[model samples]
Target: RWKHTSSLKVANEPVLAFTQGSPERDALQKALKDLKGRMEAIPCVVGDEEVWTSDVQYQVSPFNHGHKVAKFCYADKSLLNKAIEAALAARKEWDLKPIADRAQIFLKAADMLSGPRRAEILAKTMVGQGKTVIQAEIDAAAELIDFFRFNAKYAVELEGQQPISVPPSTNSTVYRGLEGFVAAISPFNFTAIGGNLAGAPALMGNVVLWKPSDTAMLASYAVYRILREAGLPPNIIQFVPADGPLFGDTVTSSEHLCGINFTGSVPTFKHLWKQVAQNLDRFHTFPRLAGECGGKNFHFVHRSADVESVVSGTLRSAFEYGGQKCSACSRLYVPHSLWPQIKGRLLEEHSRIKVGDPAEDFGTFFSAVIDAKSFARIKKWLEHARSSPSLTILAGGKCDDSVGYFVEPCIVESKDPQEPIMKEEIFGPVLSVYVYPDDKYKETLQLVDSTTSYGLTGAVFSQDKDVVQEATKVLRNAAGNFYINDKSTGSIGARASGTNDKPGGPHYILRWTSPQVIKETH
Candidate 1:
């Protein structure tokens, strides 16, 4: 007789700083060195074999522009079709396996990442994706650990939920995998997001066709290795690094591509959504679309806000990891009364920001942006603001990509709440400020809510109960995750954009599943 698997409440994984004389620090350094020496070719891992191709692209480090970390082979049409076919072929056996079998694979994989393999994942993230030591610690190690473990637990919990029986009838709920493979289109900003986007679907018994972002390929490759070591059968998930446009249409338009779990640019996500809608008549089943998109996350500081805490939170939100986090704050609304001191203190810190070379300095706060495109985009935003009449560069507005993409922590003040700087999502170390009158609290809340179409993350700083209550009530639907006085970048669960489907709340895995209600009549 089969019995239920017992599980305890999973805890949030603790993050390491890799500072001072810690053994974990030494472990990570050694791992980085070991991986660096072995850096070679990273081809597509389809089915049970490594498939190589003539078309190749090399990935270099963002911190040091000259360094070549690893290379990837892009999949052509035949290769792309093979991956999709393999995932579909494997789906028959894998999806038929008990849910417990699926859950255990992820649970063991989570343990591998949290224990022996922690340093390898962390080091690959920092070297390949230019994450600072602390940033890598959280994203690669901590967040991924939580995602895997929590997802496994959720799986078992979901299995135990059956419809109640009535007299002379037995009712049971059957959880079926999505009829076809999931297309996991992930982002570069967080390795964990990439893992979850694919792993979550795979955990729920549906196979995945995962194309990690081009920039984070090395770390994502490391993720694939960990899963393989944990004994995930080949062909269950296909790793392809092809041109999305060439084979992307084939995958998205196919009836076999059951769903798209995406987190990236809004425009691209929008196009994917439209493509699926247009090809709806060709599909055998209705496809599921789940996305966690781009964010112009914000921060609001009132006159009665804790000036010290507010300043510190704003700093952490803007400059942490070069503000590349999807939920990191780019726009700040500060009261006119608190502007002078807040402005001065922030500039003082920005002037001395330990920029570049995160490997050499674990204490370094600033690092490179993802690639040249990000640097150019940030530079363009700066140039636009510098030339505009409504904006004034308050402090620290300098950029140089001659060596490596480096931009100083920028603070631009705009009296106009409706400025382009306030509305746009500049994913960099730039904070646009709008100082409102102390009495204009309610009006400012209205302005903040109405400014952007994005509603990912935002923070409100206010010590007064009445003021806090009002802002909370007014800005209820403004952001998915709203911080009382803390930063916008949250770890509990995250999401916002055109395809802004929430992914981290209760029953997130339900999206990956197809429920069949079965009733037995006696």
Candidate 2:
């Protein structure tokens, strides 16, 4: 029954350019207005029931803290158990459904997201998650749609690979979903990631409890509704908004816990790991843990680098999303010979970045940090840079939470490369630059590799091929997605921040699957 009749192919979904005077831009404006006019009351969906609880919470726009995008209720322990039961009940039938049938539902989801649901999802992402029009388009529309289509195509590829039959004996291998349910704990930064964390597992036939981030509630809920409309059955993927500790503790304690697909902070990922370890003995099977903790990525510039490219790439990578992306470059290594030129261009471009309410300003480069907690954390780092003698804030270091959690995307020049500002993952719009002697490029590459445990992403900018090859070899283990004269933050890896599973690639589907080999003889 696990058959793929015809071959499948998928291309990356094109990101919508919401250019001025473009129809998409007008449609997005209307969608934003529509979303702003209403406050959604999202529910904890288990099976066909919309479960509401007294533990209510509001998701406020980070750009305007007073504006409520959605109100949602937290699913308590009993509800989590109920969700688990519902999921387990649905699993046998869902897993038994032909792979092509499973693939079609998600393909339909991709099309729906690409068509009717596009602007609505983007609007919710822009409002609830504080993204600019282009940012919202890329993540909510392009990336999520890409995930759905590609995951389906990959599933087909997986099904097509069968074991060899020796002589008269027949053999087959079917990829089955995990025995129990998956707990998908997603981050606030990427709406597509939240969708992928849950949707990918469900595509492979696992039932899931999707615990969406409180800050990204509305946009995530929009994704849930879209999947449902795209033909994802009730209880196949339960939309469970939950309190972190309660969700973590409850899920790990469940005897049917099959896996956890997560993306968030290092501390939380470690905490979940510990919980699973403690509850290891009680589970029906050892739960699979796949996580993507954040990273402290870097940018290395050589004397032979293209000065204009370095400035543009660094500006976009570090501040495009307020440096909220996990792979955003936090550290910079510039040669002393090129520092003055790079600094000049960087400040010139930095002055042009417009930051404010994303809805009010179409050209706004980035908006606020997610919440008060995130503001406080990033603010502390800004304060340290202000007080530290080794660190000089060259431009834009002001932070104000009076209206919104707004932090000025700033650049810091560090006298010491080993400064705390240079080492930590400040998932905020702050890039720390350390100027090194032009001849010390090799040593700088060594420093870049040694200073951080996060092997997520990094880049080297050099026109010299010899210098490029040297840095590549030296910083080989520094980043899973290493770029030659390019920005580090883009679609794509590592055990430090992740399992190096590379979700969009072919092998990631294997993580959610438990294959059973079959052999029959006449």
Candidate 3:
């Protein structure tokens, strides 16, 4: 039965700094030791059942390719359909449960993640996906916990938005789940995004078919099990690992696919969109498309900008997690006046960055790229930089994967801002700098605005107020989460990044719900 409750008071989860000899550090060390050399046999979860198919795949450590972290089986088309059918069967009763009840489950999950499950998830993220301790702590633990708590708070608030009525007639609005089910396709860069993509829909009372990334299987599976332990009903959100296209085709082909909550590459999202369009006539209703895709994020530096800040911010955004973050700053626009100073500082800082096995090096700046595909892609870009007349490898350009997919933090100076290196998403620890004349700061803003098609994130480093204001207005649509004097990535997208739903905000929960107004007259 539906009932109202007071709004849940929520705050962001605190990220633990794993300082030497600290209790958190000790716990994390133990967790890492437990997960090291261990292979997690992950299965496609469907209606309280762990479905292991004949198609087997292994998720290996990006920092140490020889170490396999998880062994998962891919779900075939028939199994995908079975999961979809299960989701539909589970949807009716699940959607009818009180929003408060659903939110309570998520809140409980948040508590468990914050306390008991923190170190284990962090360890899996580091070993499986190659995140440093701080990176894993923030992404796999803090951000994931924040999503659970905040989304639960927002769900309750959304349910409270009802219709007004006259004295003679009482009116109400039911925040119903979409008529069918949701398909949540998540990426490997952030474990939190995967949880939110699936859990948010379920929190809003919609059943979800979650296809978590193969590279992030261990951490994703850990989050899934925690949700189950916290009382998320079976089939409300089924975990079905499958080939990307197979899963996309299967879900889009279903008449019950009410929406797609996705975070991945632009081309993949486009393919899913096209698949949905092809199957438009078969759907029960107009399916909602929510996606967060790729980013070629930028850092635009003004002459008046703090040089040290630009260097520090740019280094972190470009190299942290080996620049695998979707919001990482890959393109740097610096004025000629500050380029030499900034360049020197950046090179010195970049030189100190260590790329190694995350489990062994607690202080390494970043680890490896996610997998072999990412390694090849980043290596190709490095080669292009080496050969291109307009580009010069200013600092580091090395790719060695004999042991693991290790690419040294790279810095390239580009004469052409419109070059492929500047325009395309490298998704690696490579920062391409384009130096503009000091007089052309305003025009450079135009270049920054028009250079890339992505609008996920961009930062402006400036101490001058007027320049800051001008850049803000000029690059209004340049970034969804714009930063002034800061790095592009922090916590929580636009053009080609998909739907601009702002998942961490208050409005994202509304996407999974369909409202029905009811009026009764005397």
Candidate 4:
């Protein structure tokens, strides 16, 4: 039986026994009781006469669980304002510090995170965020540590490039570092993205004001702890987990703010851009702004492509993190010859995924939608696809809210490439597959380009050498990150392909710093 320590209530016993033998029966009971105790021991914070814990069970699938991690107090804006003021006050002192010293602090933090503590942290992250244990270990913890290490090394070298010579002086050179105080707005999808944005500026000897997503407060808190333990000054960085709209206004309007780094929706990003534009005179300098906005990613499968390769790539891109990632593939263009084979393979793979409790050894293959709004959005899209004449729902239309916000993985075959489902960002585990009858491949390219307003990411799968090169060159404007054999989701440090004027490459470093030239003669 399960029991709650606080309420002292006994939960129901298991329906079936593990063994009939005496010794095995005793061991099974002990194991069951131990699990009950662990469940009861889940951590929670008592505030305002209420208890808050990260324990989240899907209303549809009780086994699929995570934690209700962050709690926001709307009344605490003064506290955040004070913290931002402190960071602004400290900016000059921090900017005056040697870049090498600042770099050392980040390097030390990375080293500290590489130890066994990271494993424990990953475990907590897995339990709290509904991520698989392995995924949490690699994607969340290991990748974050690697990002810190890479940024630390890159920070020192970033300022070392020499500028082109002008007519006046032979020794003239350029270098870049902190502009001043930076504001970072991070998302909940990746714990590392938030840490990297805040730490990147700090490494350049700038004070940072961070606003982490309310959903990721625990991970953010742990990051703060690690930085503090690694000897960073207490006020070097500050965290404010507030309502996005209000917090965004404060950050953009602050007179002392230097720059803003953001990762979220396009609407919100556009709003931020307007806010900053409206208050341009408040700052001493024009604050630098960099953002990773929403994407309606696509995958194009050429006639010569392998069916298994297309299905596997599409599934990985769409289902990873329950399709919450900004780069997740939402649309696909398939050659008509391979359509039947690819559809079969996708169905087979869909049946293999096990969606249930996150802590189970294999755990649930999928977790609940992040919140009610996301759940409702996915539901609306699914319903629209079901009723639309231009689409065919292939598998998993059922949504269960009995335990958690659970929706069956969905795949739709679109009769028209321009169907709303095919052209829009669903932001769920939904795939809209569009097929082209032409083998000449011109239609494939046309379908990809005409499908979405977003040019963030896309993938092309084909073994034909000529098709690969031609597709890459022709579909260049389709996405910022284009893939030949893979999906277009994981381009962390690489040059992301984008439009001609707004080319998005590894030139992200250019967004954070400005070059200064100096001349000398002996």
What lDDT is obtained when candidate 1 is compared to the true structure? 0.79
lDDT of 2: 0.85
Each prediction's number of clashing residue pairs = 0, 0, 0, 16
Where is model 4 more than 4 Å wrong at Cα? Answer: 1-67, 70-77, 162-180, 187-193, 491-507, 520-522
**What ranges in model 3 sit over 4 Å off?**
1-4, 187-193, 491-507
**What local distance difference test score does each model get?**
0.79, 0.85, 0.85, 0.64
**Model 2, residue 266: what's the lDDT?**
81
Candidate 3 pairs with clashing backbones: none
Weakest 10 consecutive residues of candidate 1 by summed lDDT: 492-501
Clashing pairs in 2: none
lDDT of 4 by residue, 196-246 (tens): 667766766667777665455555656766887777775677755555677
Residue-by-residue lDDT tens digits, candidate 1, 12-119: 676775669998999988887775634557889898799899988877777776777788877887887888888988997887888878877887888888879898
Give per-residue lDDT, candidate 3, residue 401.
96
The residue ranges of model 1 lying beyond 4 angstroms of the native Cα positions read: 1-9, 35-38, 187-193, 491-507
True lDDT of residue 396, candidate 4: 83
